Design a binder for this molecule. Structure first.
Ligand code: GNP
Ligand code: CA
Ligand code: CA
Ligand code: MG
Ligand code: MG
Length: 166
Protein backbone atom coordinates (compact mmCIF):
# COMPACT_ATOMS: atom_id res chain seq x y z
CA UNK A 1 0.00 0.00 0.00
CA UNK A 2 0.84 3.66 -0.44
CA UNK A 3 2.81 4.95 2.54
CA UNK A 4 2.94 8.53 3.77
CA UNK A 5 6.00 9.37 5.87
CA UNK A 6 4.70 12.04 8.24
CA UNK A 7 6.89 13.86 10.76
CA UNK A 8 5.44 15.87 13.67
CA UNK A 9 7.85 18.66 14.66
CA UNK A 10 7.77 21.61 17.03
CA UNK A 11 9.07 22.93 20.33
CA UNK A 12 8.93 20.98 23.58
CA UNK A 13 5.45 20.63 25.07
CA UNK A 14 3.31 21.98 22.21
CA UNK A 15 1.34 18.73 22.03
CA UNK A 16 3.07 16.74 19.26
CA UNK A 17 2.54 13.43 21.05
CA UNK A 18 -0.95 14.35 22.28
CA UNK A 19 -2.02 15.04 18.69
CA UNK A 20 -0.56 11.79 17.35
CA UNK A 21 -2.02 9.73 20.21
CA UNK A 22 -5.44 11.30 19.69
CA UNK A 23 -5.24 10.41 15.98
CA UNK A 24 -4.00 6.82 16.45
CA UNK A 25 -5.32 5.77 19.87
CA UNK A 26 -8.50 7.92 20.01
CA UNK A 27 -7.85 9.49 23.39
CA UNK A 28 -6.30 12.33 25.37
CA UNK A 29 -4.68 11.84 28.77
CA UNK A 30 -3.21 14.90 30.49
CA UNK A 31 0.27 13.82 31.60
CA UNK A 32 3.94 14.76 31.42
CA UNK A 33 5.78 12.36 29.12
CA UNK A 34 8.54 13.94 26.98
CA UNK A 35 9.35 12.14 23.74
CA UNK A 36 12.72 10.85 22.64
CA UNK A 37 11.52 9.44 19.31
CA UNK A 38 8.41 7.36 18.71
CA UNK A 39 7.03 5.81 15.53
CA UNK A 40 3.37 5.05 14.84
CA UNK A 41 2.36 2.99 11.80
CA UNK A 42 -1.38 2.89 11.21
CA UNK A 43 -3.35 1.68 8.22
CA UNK A 44 -6.24 4.06 7.45
CA UNK A 45 -8.70 4.80 4.66
CA UNK A 46 -8.47 8.36 3.34
CA UNK A 47 -10.90 9.35 0.60
CA UNK A 48 -11.65 5.71 -0.14
CA UNK A 49 -8.04 4.52 -0.43
CA UNK A 50 -6.09 2.31 1.94
CA UNK A 51 -2.78 3.81 3.00
CA UNK A 52 -0.18 3.43 5.70
CA UNK A 53 0.50 6.44 7.87
CA UNK A 54 4.05 6.13 9.14
CA UNK A 55 4.13 8.93 11.74
CA UNK A 56 7.39 9.97 13.40
CA UNK A 57 6.76 11.69 16.75
CA UNK A 58 9.89 13.73 17.48
CA UNK A 59 11.51 15.40 20.49
CA UNK A 60 11.16 19.12 21.03
CA UNK A 61 14.61 19.38 22.63
CA UNK A 62 16.94 21.82 20.87
CA UNK A 63 19.86 19.61 21.99
CA UNK A 64 18.95 16.91 19.42
CA UNK A 65 19.92 19.03 16.42
CA UNK A 66 21.79 16.44 14.34
CA UNK A 67 19.10 13.78 14.75
CA UNK A 68 16.72 16.47 13.49
CA UNK A 69 18.49 16.87 10.13
CA UNK A 70 18.15 13.12 9.64
CA UNK A 71 14.39 12.78 10.05
CA UNK A 72 13.83 15.94 8.02
CA UNK A 73 15.99 14.44 5.27
CA UNK A 74 13.84 11.31 5.08
CA UNK A 75 10.39 12.64 5.99
CA UNK A 76 7.76 13.19 3.32
CA UNK A 77 5.46 15.76 4.90
CA UNK A 78 5.61 17.71 8.15
CA UNK A 79 3.02 18.60 10.76
CA UNK A 80 4.55 21.83 12.08
CA UNK A 81 3.08 22.26 15.56
CA UNK A 82 3.09 25.19 17.95
CA UNK A 83 0.77 25.95 20.86
CA UNK A 84 -1.54 28.96 20.67
CA UNK A 85 -0.80 29.84 24.33
CA UNK A 86 3.01 29.85 23.87
CA UNK A 87 4.47 32.66 21.78
CA UNK A 88 7.99 31.23 21.99
CA UNK A 89 6.81 27.99 20.37
CA UNK A 90 5.49 30.08 17.46
CA UNK A 91 8.91 31.71 16.95
CA UNK A 92 10.51 28.27 17.18
CA UNK A 93 8.28 26.74 14.52
CA UNK A 94 9.59 29.27 12.00
CA UNK A 95 13.09 27.90 12.63
CA UNK A 96 11.93 24.30 12.15
CA UNK A 97 10.32 25.16 8.82
CA UNK A 98 13.44 26.94 7.57
CA UNK A 99 15.53 23.94 8.65
CA UNK A 100 13.27 21.57 6.69
CA UNK A 101 13.81 23.70 3.59
CA UNK A 102 17.60 23.72 4.05
CA UNK A 103 17.95 19.97 4.65
CA UNK A 104 15.56 18.99 1.86
CA UNK A 105 16.75 21.66 -0.63
CA UNK A 106 13.15 22.59 -1.33
CA UNK A 107 10.46 25.14 -0.58
CA UNK A 108 7.90 22.69 -1.98
CA UNK A 109 7.82 20.27 0.95
CA UNK A 110 4.27 19.33 2.04
CA UNK A 111 3.62 20.96 5.40
CA UNK A 112 0.68 21.94 7.59
CA UNK A 113 1.09 24.63 10.26
CA UNK A 114 -0.82 23.53 13.37
CA UNK A 115 -1.83 25.79 16.23
CA UNK A 116 -2.52 23.29 19.01
CA UNK A 117 -4.28 23.62 22.40
CA UNK A 118 -7.07 25.78 20.95
CA UNK A 119 -9.25 24.70 23.91
CA UNK A 120 -7.20 26.90 26.30
CA UNK A 121 -8.23 30.44 27.18
CA UNK A 122 -4.82 32.13 27.50
CA UNK A 123 -4.16 32.50 23.79
CA UNK A 124 -1.08 34.56 22.96
CA UNK A 125 -0.74 33.81 19.23
CA UNK A 126 -3.47 35.29 17.06
CA UNK A 127 -4.81 33.19 14.20
CA UNK A 128 -4.04 35.93 11.66
CA UNK A 129 -0.35 35.83 12.68
CA UNK A 130 -0.19 32.09 12.03
CA UNK A 131 -2.15 32.49 8.77
CA UNK A 132 0.42 34.99 7.47
CA UNK A 133 3.27 32.60 8.28
CA UNK A 134 1.53 29.73 6.49
CA UNK A 135 0.72 31.97 3.52
CA UNK A 136 4.40 32.85 3.17
CA UNK A 137 5.11 29.11 2.86
CA UNK A 138 2.10 28.36 0.67
CA UNK A 139 0.77 25.86 3.22
CA UNK A 140 -2.46 25.41 5.21
CA UNK A 141 -2.96 26.64 8.78
CA UNK A 142 -5.23 24.50 10.98
CA UNK A 143 -5.96 24.88 14.69
CA UNK A 144 -6.30 21.79 16.88
CA UNK A 145 -7.05 20.61 20.39
CA UNK A 146 -5.55 17.24 21.19
CA UNK A 147 -7.77 17.36 24.30
CA UNK A 148 -11.16 17.78 22.59
CA UNK A 149 -10.01 16.18 19.26
CA UNK A 150 -11.10 19.37 17.43
CA UNK A 151 -9.25 19.58 14.11
CA UNK A 152 -7.01 16.55 14.74
CA UNK A 153 -8.20 14.45 11.79
CA UNK A 154 -8.37 17.63 9.70
CA UNK A 155 -4.73 18.47 10.35
CA UNK A 156 -3.30 15.01 9.67
CA UNK A 157 -5.54 14.21 6.70
CA UNK A 158 -4.92 17.64 5.16
CA UNK A 159 -1.18 16.90 5.36
CA UNK A 160 -1.82 13.56 3.60
CA UNK A 161 -3.78 15.36 0.89
CA UNK A 162 -0.98 17.93 0.55
CA UNK A 163 1.40 15.06 -0.17
CA UNK A 164 -0.99 13.11 -2.37
CA UNK A 165 -1.60 16.08 -4.68
CA UNK A 166 1.97 17.47 -4.52
N1 GNP B 1 -5.23 21.68 27.12
C1 GNP B 1 -4.44 21.00 26.27
N2 GNP B 1 -3.34 20.43 26.74
C2 GNP B 1 -2.65 19.78 25.76
C3 GNP B 1 -2.96 19.67 24.42
N3 GNP B 1 -1.99 18.92 23.75
C4 GNP B 1 -1.14 18.60 24.67
N4 GNP B 1 -1.48 19.07 25.91
C5 GNP B 1 -0.75 18.91 27.16
O1 GNP B 1 0.45 19.64 27.03
C6 GNP B 1 1.55 18.90 27.61
C7 GNP B 1 2.56 18.56 26.51
O2 GNP B 1 2.00 17.60 25.59
P1 GNP B 1 2.90 16.64 24.75
O3 GNP B 1 1.98 15.95 23.81
O4 GNP B 1 3.64 15.74 25.66
O5 GNP B 1 3.89 17.58 24.00
P2 GNP B 1 5.09 17.25 23.09
O6 GNP B 1 5.18 18.33 22.06
O7 GNP B 1 4.91 15.87 22.56
N5 GNP B 1 6.39 17.28 24.03
P3 GNP B 1 7.87 16.76 23.70
O8 GNP B 1 8.51 17.70 22.71
O9 GNP B 1 8.68 16.90 24.98
O10 GNP B 1 7.75 15.32 23.26
C8 GNP B 1 0.91 17.69 28.30
O11 GNP B 1 0.52 17.98 29.64
C9 GNP B 1 -0.34 17.47 27.45
O12 GNP B 1 -1.35 16.77 28.15
C10 GNP B 1 -4.13 20.29 23.93
O13 GNP B 1 -4.57 20.29 22.76
N6 GNP B 1 -4.83 20.96 24.95
CA1 CA C 1 20.88 22.11 1.78
CA1 CA D 1 -2.29 23.11 -0.55
MG1 MG E 1 6.12 14.26 22.65
MG1 MG F 1 9.56 25.84 -5.49
Amino acid sequence: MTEYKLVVVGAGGVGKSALTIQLIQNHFVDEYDPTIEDSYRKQVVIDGETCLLDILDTAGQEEYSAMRDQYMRTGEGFLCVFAINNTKSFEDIHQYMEQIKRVKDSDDVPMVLVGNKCDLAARTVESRQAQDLARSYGIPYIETSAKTRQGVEDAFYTLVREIRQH
